Design a protein around this motif. Structure first.
Motif, short mmCIF file in Angstrom:
data_model
loop_
_atom_site.label_atom_id
_atom_site.label_comp_id
_atom_site.label_asym_id
_atom_site.label_seq_id
_atom_site.Cartn_x
_atom_site.Cartn_y
_atom_site.Cartn_z
N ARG A 1 7.76 -0.58 -60.34
CA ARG A 1 6.59 0.06 -59.78
C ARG A 1 5.41 0.19 -60.74
O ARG A 1 5.49 -0.30 -61.86
N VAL A 2 4.26 0.72 -60.33
CA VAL A 2 3.06 0.90 -61.12
C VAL A 2 2.78 2.39 -61.27
O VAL A 2 3.11 3.17 -60.38
N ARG A 9 -4.22 1.04 -64.50
CA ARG A 9 -3.01 0.77 -63.76
C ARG A 9 -2.05 -0.05 -64.61
O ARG A 9 -2.49 -1.07 -65.15
N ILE A 10 -0.76 0.22 -64.79
CA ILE A 10 0.28 -0.45 -65.54
C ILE A 10 1.67 -0.31 -64.94
O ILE A 10 1.96 0.65 -64.22
N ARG A 11 2.56 -1.26 -65.24
CA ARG A 11 3.85 -1.56 -64.66
C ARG A 11 4.80 -0.74 -65.53
O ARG A 11 4.88 -0.91 -66.75
#
Length: 14
Positions: A1-2, A9-11
């Motif tokens: 998910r993020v 925004r990052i994983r």
RNA sequence: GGCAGAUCUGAGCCUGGGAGCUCUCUGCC
């Protein structure tokens, strides 16, 4: 998910 | 343990500035 950290925004995993 | 989801509660640190190294939250099973 993020996720949103330091306005970016990052994983994180799926 | 499993799955859901947020910086719209959050955060340590970098051989950083990120499909990074990650710890934590709160929902249900």
């Amino acid at each position: 998910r993020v996720r949103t950290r330091k306005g970016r925004r990052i994983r994180i995993x799926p």
